Amino acid sequence: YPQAIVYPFIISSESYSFKDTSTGHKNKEFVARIKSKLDQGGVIQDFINALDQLSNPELLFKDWSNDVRAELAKTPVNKKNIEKMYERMYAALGDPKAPGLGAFRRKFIQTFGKEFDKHFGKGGSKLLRMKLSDFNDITNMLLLKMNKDSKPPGNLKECSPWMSDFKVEFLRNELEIPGQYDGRGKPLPEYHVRIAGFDERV
């Protein structure tokens, strides 16, 4: 049953660690094999990205005001762990062309990428370099983002092309509606309802 395992495995694999002993290397190898058998197909990641394109593209920045403010101050040791932060944003907010990208996020990129690039620039080095109360510019960015959203995205075509033009063809693109393995009192058939399409109205 490679789905009821794949969702919690993707949830858990975000935060892992491994020791330098032989047992740690064995665990790392086993996790690598599990990921290898679980990452086949690629339909799950496409579904995840398509559902992530439905997210409001300024609230993700608003939680940034919730995250790096934790870095601001304290930090007797600032550390280099904020290097994954900029990759996480630029893979979802900063990239002019990303897989599954719709028109709404493309417009947000075209209207704010150069803005925050000239605002900070090479954000990995600058954020650790400067540490003071200069971060009040989040209000200046967020007011413009809040008055720039304007109308809701509406239909699925402007949200995500993958969901609008989803199509199940033979011997591939197999997807199952999540939340069907109850795991109680009986084994599950795997007849489980599969995904055939999405309604165009959001």
Partner: protein, 403 residues
């Protein structure tokens, strides 16, 4: 696309019928307005089409030709129908043969090969991606195994339709120019999958490493799709032999002509051994016609000797003599009656093709057929009481029919 979506449906609903009527109405709409739709105006972009500024009917016929290799049955049939009905309405009045010449010439034969074997459109798939059922991965299921058979059915249908109507030459389209994968799939199905059951389709503890189970209806569902492909193989062979005078050299690329004769003579003697299910007259009515047509195709080809040689062991003038009178007209032993009926039906089918004398020739040479005389005598004396035990045989519906 709605017709293609209605593949996994039932014939009682009427979706196929209504969608077909809608497609015919549309077809008539273009056929009455083709001169205005030929010019490249700016029209709405249909789903699945590449982005562009101007739409022509030529783009529509190219889309139909590309989607001619659809795994779905009715949608593929209609795709070929629209293609052949819409090619004449181009700016020229050229036949589809001449049109495919220049289109093949611009892009080589490999374009047509990828169209036929692509298993649809877009991403590479179909028998070219999976020539045999050994290329698949994952746990084997009854839903997944039928897809290969559907892809083979689609490839056979497009090749037969584009060869039998004198559209593209067989040597040009399936010769030695490039990879074909059609002969390989046909040989793999005829030798390794045909004359077998689902337990042989699942191999024997392959990469799945799971015995699992098999529902009783799963066997019938697999057998329907299995028997659907052997028939199309028979019309494919018949079409090749009848259309290509030099088609025997390409037929040698089958590499399993012995297995083709095996399935032919097994369909002769007892069709239900392969998997042909009784109950529907429609499926079993087409079987003798295609068998006779295949026989008449092989007889006028340099394959008469091998066909006759493989045929004799199955139908022999001595086997009928030793089987025709074994406790006949009895209340029991219906298996002998069924075997005699199967043998006589095979003899009738051999007479239809015109090979009855060769399979069972005269052995007396006295102006009187040896086997026919003995059959007459057996029928004429089997209704007699026999000896002097004063017992008159009784005849039922089956006994009278066999006599």
């Amino acid at each position: 696309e709605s017709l293609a979506l209605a593949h996994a449906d039932e014939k009682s609903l009427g979706t196929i019928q209504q969608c077909c009527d809608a497609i015919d109405h549309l077809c008539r709409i273009i056929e009455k307005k083709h001169v205005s739709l030929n010019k490249a105006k700016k029209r709405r972009l249909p789903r699945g089409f590449p982005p562009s500024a101007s739409l022509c009917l030529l783009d529509l016929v190219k889309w139909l030709l590309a989607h001619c290799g659809r795994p779905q049955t009715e949608c593929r049939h209609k795709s070929i129908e629209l293609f052949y009905k819409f090619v004449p309405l181009l700016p020229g009045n050229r036949s589809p043969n001449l049109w495919l010449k220049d289109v093949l010439k611009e892009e080589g034969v490999s374009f047509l090969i990828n169209t036929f074997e692509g298993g649809g459109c877009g991403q590479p798939s179909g028998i070219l991606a999976q020539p045999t059922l050994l290329y698949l991965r994952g746990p084997f299921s009854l839903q997944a195994t039928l897809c290969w058979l559907d892809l083979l059915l689609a490839a056979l249908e497009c090749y037969n339709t584009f060869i039998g109507e004198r559209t593209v030459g067989a040597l040009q389209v399936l010769g030695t120019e490039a990879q074909s994968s059609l002969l390989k799939a046909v040989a793999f199905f005829l030798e390794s999958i045909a004359m077998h059951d689902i337990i042989a389709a699942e191999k024997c503890f392959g990469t799945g490493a799971a015995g699992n189970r098999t529902s009783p209806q799963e066997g019938e569902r697999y057998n329907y799709s299995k028997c659907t492909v052997v028939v199309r193989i028979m019309e494919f062979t018949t079409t090749l032999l009848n259309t290509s005078p030099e088609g025997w050299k390409l037929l040698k690329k089958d590499l399993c002509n012995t297995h083709l004769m095996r399935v032919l003579v097994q369909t002769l003697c007892e069709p239900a051994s392969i998997g042909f299910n009784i109950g529907d007259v429609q499926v079993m009515a087409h079987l003798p016609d295609v068998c006779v047509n295949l026989m008449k195709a092989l007889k006028m080809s340099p394959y008469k000797d091998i066909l006759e040689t493989h045929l004799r062991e199955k139908i022999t003038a001595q086997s009928i003599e030793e089987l025709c009178a074994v406790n006949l007209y009895g209340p029991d032993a219906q298996v002998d009656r069924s075997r005699l009926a199967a043998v006589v039906s095979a003899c009738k089918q051999l007479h239809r093709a015109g090979l009855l004398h060769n399979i069972l020739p005269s052995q007396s040479t006295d102006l009187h057929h040896s086997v026919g005389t003995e059959l007459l005598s057996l029928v004429y004396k089997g209704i007699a009481p026999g000896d002097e035990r004063q017992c008159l045989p009784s005849l039922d519906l089956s006994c009278k029919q066999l006599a």
